[PDB]
């Protein structure tokens, strides 16, 4: 139908947006610090820990299967990738630091965001 049609063209248009979100996220990271999973061999307690891991690329793959249906979804994850960090790190760490800096930075993207993904529908 035409209808599911201009449904999928929305998906898609929300999609770029979401992309171009994602990108000036990841550059308030420049250490890298969010880029990656958290590797298991790495941090064998990681799980014990931290129930819903989540990262950039892990972001990414979703997205380019367009699997986040509105931006309160993506927000959910950049969420995650903060607030985990947050509490397997200490105060005191370089990594809960760049989460703090990076929720900060990424607080003036996703405020624009909501506006533009409310104005364009
Ligand atoms: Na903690």
């Given at each position: 139908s035409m209808e599911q049609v201009a449904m999928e063209l929305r998906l898609?248009?929300?999609?770029?947006?979401?992309?171009?979100?994602?990108?000036?996220?990841?550059?308030?990271?420049?250490?890298?610090i969010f880029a990656q999973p958290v590797s298991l061999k790495e941090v064998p307690d990681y799980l014990d820990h931290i129930k819903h891991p989540m990262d950039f690329?892990?972001?990414?793959?979703?997205?380019?299967?367009?699997?986040?249906?509105?931006?309160?979804?993506?927000?959910?994850?950049?969420?995650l990738i903060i607030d985990n960090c947050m509490k397997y790190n200490a105060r005191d760490t370089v990594?809960?630091?760049?989460?703090?800096?990076?929720?900060?930075?990424?607080?003036?993207?996703?405020?624009?965001?909501?506006?533009?993904?409310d104005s364009i529908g």
């Open positions: 898609t248009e929300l999609t770029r947006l979401l992309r171009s979100v994602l990108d000036q996220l990841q550059d308030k990271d420049p250490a890298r690329a892990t972001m990414r793959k979703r997205l380019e299967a367009q699997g986040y249906k509105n931006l309160h979804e993506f927000e959910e994850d950049f969420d990594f809960y630091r760049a989460a703090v800096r990076l929720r900060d930075q990424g607080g003036v993207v996703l405020r624009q965001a909501r506006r533009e993904v």
